[PDB]
Design a protein around this ligand. Structure first.
Ligand SMILES: *C[C@@](C)(O)[C@](*)(O)[C@H](CC(C)C)NC(=O)[C@H](Cc1ccccc1)NC(=O)[C@H](CC(C)C)NC(=O)[C@H](CCc1ccccc1)NC(=O)CN1CCOCC1
Ligand SMILES: [Mg+2]
Lengths: 222, 195, 235, 240, 233, 231, 212, 244
């Protein structure tokens, strides 16, 4: 029997700051135990200061990103070059995903950017289009490894003020872009050590009011 | 939906239908009326798959009410039962059939006679002095075979029905949370509030 | 006979030009846009005194931020309003935001030329679509059965339109308040109407950012009519 | 399919097929609607060119759409059946989905929308029918009376008439109907409705039909003898 | 949904300093039967692109006709069909990738794995993969089937990352491809000795080599292998 | 006369009157100019208002990052045809990863307009279009007429009084073709060309509409105080 | 998931948990399972996250269209039936939804309708829905009376979700509370279970099963 | 295109009349007269054939009186071929109703359905209307004996006695003169034949010119019998009433 789905591996990570947001993804693409590519970009600038990644089955991922990029183009045409806000992009993506409710896109999608108050925003989607805004999200093969670390280091979960017995929580803070990138790099270095499908390279897209910047880092190739 | 019973006496038809609505582990409701008035002298009780039961009952209700307005006339129980049967017989060869079994209790004002029709989800219609759908009939038919007479009063019919419900409460595994009882006679449809 | 989508020798569609004549026979509707809001007013024009005038619905809500007034064959407007409401709600469903006033108007106007041998004839009604959005602010649009729409600082349509438009030419300025615009609509309606203007045969409405689209009560409009009479008598 | 645009604009901005449909309404027998304080009455003319009729089985002029709403009409009889059927179907569909009977305004808006659709659809002519739709909303004691016409416009009326010589009866109602104090009782409202028909009918009681609709689905049609008593009382008062 | 019947095995490829190389053997297998020995599985499109196809041969012949028809269609009302508006590798690939994903989405795939190799207008190397699922990827080396498991490791020793591409000459790159084809003949049960090889260079153009054979094979050590453990003779 | 009732009927001299009547709607429309050099291509459009309270009707529509048009005649027909061009540009990008050639865009518009001239029930398009673009063979300017005829040109104009601008461009041909790597001077020549079609009215800030596409320039529309520089 | 709604003297209490799961993986602890349809209407979500979010958001649009067309607030009965008729069209296709539509209108008074993906639609005074429904029912049914104070009713709803969050592996995160009156719904806060559990343990003297 | 040749069969005149319906009624006015008379104990249907030829086989002929079911019959005036299209549709509707409700169709419901079909041809489809008027004679247990008529407009009305086709003005005056409410079938038979005998354009009324039928609740043990009269039986009833 023909199986229309596959698994291309890979892992992605979104973190929202005070006046910025990052979307990071490894550059490795795999099937079974073979490496298809060591550098196959997975996180994309979609215009209007929005970055997107649809990790999982790469053919469905590419199809979804391609359709969303096109949705942005037609939003400009139909509404007088108006900027598509991150909240509006998210709702549009829900309808793209739920449109294939009974033959789903096999992906976990993350978008990142700035909200209409200039604050950092990360949205997260399941395969059939349920979504939520969050400070943190990891998706893909090593999500189970990375997310608990982010709960601890971004949202300060299970951390208390020393000497208060255990009744004052560590107060929540926004992290600097330098501090976020440190957490991103350590997350992927850790994931690469323990997950076989994670490795080769790390590509981070950083979104600010000034625009979209890129950073690339080597990961272990075994 | 579990237990629906019907009994036709001298001058009326009595329908008894269980109040429980159960989904899996929990009893969600204990006061559910498993019936619809189709016309002033015709009542339909129903049981079967969740969703299908109410959707089918209300669909039949709408159609009979439409007929009543158009002709300014009440269809006989026999005519309503034949309409219902055809809808179910059509349904069984569809993409997704209605999994609904019904009893139709009516008083024919022309003939001055009570009438009880039992129809299953396949469109199998029978006119009976007493009827039941599902596992109920395994207990209740033998009782009614013993105690029923055609010339019984409505009060005697209700006592005979209490004897059916007592037996079902003794021997059936599921707690069906009692029954709502409704009487159909020359004066219309009324609910027995204490049972 | 002749085609429904036929061009005349001058380069105009016969049926579109003939529908514009139907709109001239309709009751008057006036719209005035300001920086404090957009005001929409209509002549009700009851055919008999036994007709309960409050049932004449010529001003209509499309969304909270978009209102609409009509003039011409008003029965034709119902499917246009239905489309506008659906387009407004549908865009909110797809994009989690209010739809732009221009985009809504464009959607309504796309229906207009869908006729041939689709519907059998053009619409016999013109619309004044008034609203607010964050990008372009308070706006007023005139939607025709040609499929064309123009934005206006102020606009009159219907039987008294050319007379009303000349009056709007002189009276409108960029610093108009909302209260001033209300009185100005009532003034110009009173001028062009056959019957004497009162709260029962004329209707006001507006759209503000804070309170959205509101049809005015007869008691509220009555006070504005009384305020108008006094200020005209004042000089 | 037959796609031909029959309803189209003419140079002066008129849709002749819609206007010619109004002429069919002008030809039809007179119908009148009067609402009181706690009732609505629908009066209808029956032309007496047709005797040897069977009045048991002949289609009655007033039709129940639901138990709480009625529809009378002037114009083509065959056309009226199509509107009545669609309205009856929509009334049951509304009960099925909204779990509430239609308001009189809603039912009117539906019938009016059907009429409008037939003025800009290919291959069809407009309905040669105007309607009076009357009744009471669910759990409401305020009387409702609406009118529709072939174009699809509708509106609410304190009282109204349609059909042949409707100009004359509308004249009568405009002077005799007071808004500040309408017909307080059923008797007063029926009397004013019969009086208004007696301006045009020019015959006794066989040519007048009356239907009284009251709140909470209380609809009854008056008999010949009951109407004939109103006819007797009106003319005895008139001889003075 | 179907099953592949007549099949082609590995297609292998790599980038070098001035262009790309691609290769595939000349066999059409019918299960374990080595049925057809003269099947060409490298199909050139213009003078700048070669499409290498593995998998179902009936579906390959369909794709071949689509590409042939694509050239015809591009020439229509196009005075620059042999110049600025000629078909590019990137155009040919995207077309195939669209078709592949559309067909998988109708549950009726073209049962193939495809590598489009070529050189663009600006001299840039093009090398990208697509298969029956619509999955796409690019890398300095690409291979289908057994070639993914055996050829890629060898070809990646020559070009391990992007920065190695300018350092790799056409002689070194061809040598690596020819050796990889020998290794596949030793080790793939559905391969043949006879193969075709294509070089697309930005300077020297398209060079298409037919009727190549695997040569310099080592079998001599076989004489010394006896039994499966204890047998001495 | 008797042969103008529909688009399916030839006249005795081999003419299609409905197409010619559609052509007349363009002449009633407001003037718009197109011109190009080797590096850039420019559209200049005189927008028309209903009265002093109204806005000025938009004349220029963007089709892709590298292509767009200006209209003259029925604006809703320009919307239908520009939407079709947007889709065809988009299909080329999604399926072939290829920016649609301007010459091929013209061929598609021609064939779309033609079908309406040969079949009963439909009508011709009532609008003329000037398509500019920059593709793999450089700058291009096209003129579309709703008869189906599409023409590639160095410069042109369509609409009311368009013959004045068209003569100027015919004289200036040798000068403006050489304006390479200088967008402001090419726009100046377009603004000076459209000025030859003006009578009574002159170019004000909310009257004028300019668009440009070129080598390292996406298709961008200039309106309002953005065109005050060129007045 | 655990969701509940109940009727009482002072209106309706609605309480839900905030957890989303993918098998045994805890996908989120911060999901919103209440949708505010209008100021007098609430929807609760249990089952497939996408199915619930999409169709209840869609329901909000259909309710808005009703009030534009009819110039009147949609009834709770009519709103619930739009959703139940929609899911009935999709029956057998595999939608997963367990919902409560809770609101006030003048004609109905405070009303709760249970609606699920196999087509069942039920009016009632008390409902608990989701994987943890049994645990909520246990606490709710024992301390329920018609005439609780608004303060006591809010607490019972909060406490019933806490009970289910504790025992049900697939419920947790936080408790979102709502109170529906004549004047509309009122939000009564997000309550993290990681702090609420210990607060309730100390003050109430309950949860003696736990090492504290 | 094709618009040039379209007669536009479903439009209003300036006066608000349907051209084609009016012209169809003009066609029907030339067709052979049909009379229906309803009594307390039955209904009579009498009708005059149009084509007198000695070589017409009368005993196997049927142009006027058709059976719809056991309880309902029709008399036709107009185009016979048009009528047969409608008759077969009405026969099917009756059996659909019997299949659905297990009860014989009420007379009005059958009449309304046919009348709605005729109406449709006047409002949409661009086709000519049916050039037919029917007299329906029927019985059901709600209203008992019923007479209806329908015409090409799709309008229908109920009657105690009625005529369609030729000389209806004259026929209806004569029926209005001699009809009484307490009348019986035997008297109604005589009235029907006397009315045709005076209105006929022929020199004399004979057996070979008539189709005749009765619906009586005068069958064995309270049932309803449809009698389509044979030629010899029409000849006998002509002698009995004293016309020949
Ligand atoms: C907590 C509760 C008791 O389950 C409660 O009902 C909540 C209520 C929601 C939050 C409103 N329900 C869930 O959390 C559901 C449970 C459920 C799962 C699957 C089917 C039905 C019900 N969770 C989700 O819907 C889940 C939310 C994500 C994790 C944010 N989504 C999925 O599990 C997702 C889609 C499932 C699906 C696919 C196709 C058709 C229909 C539904 N599946 C995946 O992401 C698959 N997989 C990918 C790798 O990581 C593990 C998950
Ligand atoms: Mg737990």
């Amino acid at each position: 029997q023909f199986n229309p789905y596959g698994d291309n591996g890979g892992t992605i990570l979104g973190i929202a700051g005070e006046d910025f947001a990052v979307l990071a993804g490894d550059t490795r693409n795999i099937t079974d135990y073979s490496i298809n590519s060591r550098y196959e970009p997975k996180v994309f600038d979609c215009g209007d200061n929005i970055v997107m990644s649809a990790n999982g089955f790469a053919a469905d991922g590419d199809a979804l990103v391609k359709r969303f990029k096109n949705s942005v183009k037609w939003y400009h045409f139909d509404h007088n070059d108006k900027k598509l806000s991150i909240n509006s992009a998210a709702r549009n993506i829900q309808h793209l995903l739920y449109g294939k409710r009974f033959f789903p896109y096999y992906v976990h999608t993350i978008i990142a950017g700035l909200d209409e108050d200039g604050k950092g925003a990360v949205y997260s989607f399941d395969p059939v289009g349920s979504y939520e805004r969050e400070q943190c999200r990891a998706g893909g093969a090593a999500a189970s490894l990375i997310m608990p670390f982010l709960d601890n280091q971004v949202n300060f979960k299970n951390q208390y003020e020393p000497g208060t017995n255990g009744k004052v929580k560590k107060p929540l803070k926004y992290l600097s872009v330098e501090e976020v990138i440190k957490l991103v790099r350590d997350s992927f270095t850790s994931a690469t050590e323990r997950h076989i499908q994670v490795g080769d390279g790390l590509e981070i897209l950083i979104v600010t009011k000034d625009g979209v910047r890129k950073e690339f880092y080597e990961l272990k190739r075994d | 939906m579990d237990i629906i019973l019907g009994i036709r006496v001298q001058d009326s038809v009595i329908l008894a239908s269980s109040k429980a609505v159960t989904r899996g582990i929990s009893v969600l409701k204990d006061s559910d009326d498993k019936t619809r008035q189709l016309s002033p002298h015709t009542l339909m009780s129903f049981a079967g798959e969740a969703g299908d039961t109410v959707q089918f009952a209300e669909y039949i209700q709408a159609n009979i009410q439409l007929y009543s307005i158009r002709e300014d006339y009440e269809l006989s129980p026999q005519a309503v039962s034949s309409f219902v049967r055809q809808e179910l017989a059509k349904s069984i060869r569809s993409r997704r059939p209605y999994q609904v079994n019904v009893l139709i209790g009516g008083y024919d004002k022309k003939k001055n006679k009570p009438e009880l029709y039992q129809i299953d989800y396949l469109g199998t219609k029978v006119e009976l002095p007493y009827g039941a759908h599902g596992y109920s009939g395994f207990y209740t038919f033998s009782l009614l075979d013993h105690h029923y007479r055609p010339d019984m009063t409505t009060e005697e019919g209700l006592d005979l029905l209490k004897l059916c419900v007592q037996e079902l409460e003794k021997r059936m595994p599921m707690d069906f949370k009692g029954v709502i009882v409704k009487i159909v006679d020359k004066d219309g449809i009324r609910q027995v509030d204490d049972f | 006979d002749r085609g429904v989508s036929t061009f005349s020798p001058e380069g105009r569609l016969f049926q579109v030009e003939y529908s514009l004549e139907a709109i001239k026979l309709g009751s008057t509707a006036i719209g005035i846009a300001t920086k404090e809001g957009v005001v929409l007013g209509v002549e009700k024009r009851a055919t008999s005194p036994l007709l309960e005038s409050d049932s004449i619905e010529k001003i209509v809500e499309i969304d909270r931020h978009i209102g609409c007034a009509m003039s011409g064959l008003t029965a034709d407007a119902r499917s246009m309003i239905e489309h506008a409401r659906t387009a407004a709600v549908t865009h909110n469903l797809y994009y989690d935001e209010d739809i732009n006033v221009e985009s809504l108007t464009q959607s309504v106007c796309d229906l207009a030329l869908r006729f041939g041998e689709l519907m059998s004839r053009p619409f016999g009604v013109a619309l004044l679509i008034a609203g607010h959005d964050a990008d372009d602010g308070y706006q007023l649009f005139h939607a025709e059965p040609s499929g064309t729409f123009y934005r206006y600082n102020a606009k009159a349509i219907g039987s008294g339109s050319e007379g009303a438009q000349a009056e709007l030419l002189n009276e409108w300025h960029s610093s108009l308040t909302l209260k001033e615009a209300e009185l100005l609509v009532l003034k110009i309606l009173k001028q062009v109407m056959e019957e004497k203007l009162d709260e029962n045969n004329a209707q006001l409405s507006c759209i503000t950012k804070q309170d959205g689209f509101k049809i005015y009560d007869n008691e509220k409009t009555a006070e504005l009519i009384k305020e108008l009479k006094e200020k005209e008598a004042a000089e | 399919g037959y796609d031909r645009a029959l309803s189209i604009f003419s140079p002066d901005g008129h849709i002749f097929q819609v206007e010619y449909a109004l002429e069919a309404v002008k030809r039809g027998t007179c119908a009148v609607g009067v609402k009181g304080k706690n009732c609505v009455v629908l009066g209808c003319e029956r032309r007496s060119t047709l005797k040897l009729q069977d009045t048991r089985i002949t289609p009655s002029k007033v039709s129940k759409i639901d138990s709480h709403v009625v529809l009378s009409f002037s114009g083509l009889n065959a056309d009226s059946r199509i509107l009545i059927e669609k309205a009856r179907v929509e009334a049951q569909s509304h009960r099925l989905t909204l779990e509430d009977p239609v308001t009189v305004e809603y039912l009117t808006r539906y019938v009016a929308g059907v009429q409008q659709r037939y003025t800009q659809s290919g291959g069809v002519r407009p309905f040669g029918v105007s309607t009076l739709i009357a009744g009471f909303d669910p759990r409401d004691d305020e009387p409702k009376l609406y009118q529709t016409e072939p174009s699809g416009i509708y509106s609410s009326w304190s009282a109204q008439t349609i059909g042949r010589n409707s100009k004359t009866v509308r004249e009568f109602l405009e002077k005799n109907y007071d808004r500040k104090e309408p017909p307080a009782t059923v008797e007063e409202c029926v009397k004013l409705t019969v009086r208004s028909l007696l301006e045009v009918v020019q015959t006794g009681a066989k040519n007048i039909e009356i239907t009284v609709v009251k709140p909470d689905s209380d609809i009854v049609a008056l008999s010949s003898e009951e109407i004939n008593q109103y006819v007797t009382q009106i003319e005895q008062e008139k001889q003075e | 949904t179907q099953q592949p019947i007549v099949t082609g095995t590995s297609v292998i490829s790599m980038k070098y300093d001035n262009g790309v190389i691609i290769a595939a053997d000349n066999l059409g297998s019918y299960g374990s039967l080595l049925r057809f020995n003269g099947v060409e599985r490298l199909i050139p499109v213009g003078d700048n692109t070669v499409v290498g196809i593995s998998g179902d041969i009936s579906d390959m012949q369909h794709i071949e006709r689509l590409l042939k028809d694509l050239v015809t269609e591009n020439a229509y009302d196009n005075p620059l069909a042999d110049a600025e508006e000629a078909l590019e590798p990137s155009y040919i690939f995207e077309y195939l990738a669209t078709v592949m994903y559309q067909r998988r989405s109708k549950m009726n795939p073209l049962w193939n794995a495809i590598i489009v190799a070529g050189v663009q207008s600006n001299g840039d190397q093009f090398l990208r993969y697509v298969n029956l699922l619509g999955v796409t990827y690019s890398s300095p080396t690409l291979a289908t089937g057994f070639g993914a498991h055996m050829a890629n490791p060898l070809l990646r020793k020559v070009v391990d990352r992007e920065s190695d591409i300018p350092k790799t000459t056409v002689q070194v790159a061809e040598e690596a491809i020819v050796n990889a084809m020998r290794v596949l003949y030793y080790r793939d049960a559905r391969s043949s000795r006879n193969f075709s090889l294509a070089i697309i260079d930005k300077n020297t153009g398209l060079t298409f080599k037919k009727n190549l054979q695997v040569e310099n094979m080592k079998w001599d050590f076989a004489k010394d292998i006896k039994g499966y453990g204890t047998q001495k003779i | 006369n008797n042969y103008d009732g529909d688009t399916v009927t030839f006249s005795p001299t081999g003419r299609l009157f409905q197409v010619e009547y559609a052509l007349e709607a363009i002449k009633q429309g407001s003037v718009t100019v197109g011109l190009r050099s080797n590096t850039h291509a420019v559209l200049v459009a005189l927008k028309r208002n209903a009265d002093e309270l109204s806005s000025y009707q938009k004349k220029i529509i963007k089709c892709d990052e590298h292509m767009g048009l200006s209209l003259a005649g029925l604006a809703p027909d320009a919307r239908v045809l520009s939407n079709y061009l947007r889709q065809q540009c988009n299909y080329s990008s999604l399926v072939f990863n290829r920016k649609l050639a301007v010459e091929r865009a013209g061929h598609l518009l021609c064939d779309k307009a033609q079908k309406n001239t040969q079949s009963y029930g439909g009508r011709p398009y009532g609008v003329g279009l000037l398509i500019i673009g920059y593709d793999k063979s450089g700058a291009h300017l096209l003129e579309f007429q709703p008869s189906g005829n599409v023409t590639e040109l160095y410069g042109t104009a369509i609409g009311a009084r368009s013959q004045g601008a068209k003569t100027y461009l015919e004289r200036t041909l040798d000068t403006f073709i050489k304006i390479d790597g200088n967008p402001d001077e090419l726009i100046k020549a377009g603004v000076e060309a459209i000025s030859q079609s003006l009578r009574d009215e002159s170019l004000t800030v909310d009257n004028l509409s300019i668009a440009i596409v070129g080598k390292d320039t996406p298709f961008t529309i200039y309106d309002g105080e953005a065109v005050a520089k060129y007045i | 998931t655990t969701t509940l709604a109940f009727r009482f003297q002072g209106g309706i209490i609605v309480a839900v948990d905030s957890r989303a799961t993918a098998g045994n993986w805890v996908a989120s602890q911060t999901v919103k399972k209440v949708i505010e349809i209008n100021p007098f209407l609430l929807g609760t979500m249990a089952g497939g996250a996408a199915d619930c979010q999409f169709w209840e958001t869609w329901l909000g649009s259909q309710c808005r269209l009703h009030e534009l067309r009819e110039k009147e607030r949609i009834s709770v009965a009519a709103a619930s039936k739009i959703l139940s008729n929609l899911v009935y069209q999709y029956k057998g296709a595999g939608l997963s939804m367990g919902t409560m539509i809770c609101g006030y209108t003048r004609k109905e008074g405070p009303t709760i309708y249970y609606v699920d993906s196999d087509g069942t639609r039920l009016k009632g005074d008390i409902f608990c829905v989701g994987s943890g429904q049994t645990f909520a029912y246990g606490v709710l049914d024992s301390n329920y009376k018609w005439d609780l104070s608004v303060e006591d009713a809010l607490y019972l709803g909060k406490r019933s979700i806490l009970a289910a969050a504790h025992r049900d592996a697939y419920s947790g995160g936080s408790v979102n509370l709502y109170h529906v009156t004549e004047d509309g719904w009122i939000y009564h806060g997000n309550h993290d279970v990681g702090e609420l559990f210990w607060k309730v343990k100390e003050e109430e003297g309950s949860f003696n099963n736990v090492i504290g | 295109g094709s618009r040039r040749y379209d007669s536009r069969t479903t439009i209003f005149s300036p006066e608000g009349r349907l051209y084609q319906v009016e012209y169809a009624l003009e066609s029907i006015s030339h067709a052979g007269t049909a009379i229906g008379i309803m009594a307390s104990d039955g209904i009579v249907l009498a009708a005059e054939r149009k084509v007198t030829s000695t070589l017409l086989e009368q005993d196997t002929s049927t142009e006027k009186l058709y059976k719809l079911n056991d309880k309902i019959a029709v008399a036709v005036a107009g185009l016979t071929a048009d009528a047969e299209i409608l008759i077969n549709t009405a026969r099917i509707h009756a059996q659909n109703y019997l299949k659905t409700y297990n009860e014989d169709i009420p007379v009005e419901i059958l009449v309304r359905r046919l009348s709605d079909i005729k109406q449709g041809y006047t409002q949409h489809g661009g086709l000519r209307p049916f050039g037919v008027s029917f007299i329906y004679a029927g019985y059901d247990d709600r209203y008992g004996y019923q007479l209806y008529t329908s015409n090409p407009s799709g309008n229908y009305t109920g009657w105690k006695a009625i005529s369609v086709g030729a000389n209806t003005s004259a026929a209806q005056t004569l029926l209005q003169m001699d009809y009484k409410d307490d009348m019986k079938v035997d008297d109604a038979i005589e009235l029907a034949l006397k009315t045709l005998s005076k209105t006929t354009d022929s020199s004399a009324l004979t057996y070979d010119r008539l189709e005749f039928a009765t619906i009586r609740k005068g069958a064995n043990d309270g049932e309803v019998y449809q009698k389509i009269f044979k030629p010899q039986e029409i000849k006998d009833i002509l002698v009995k009433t004293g016309i020949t």
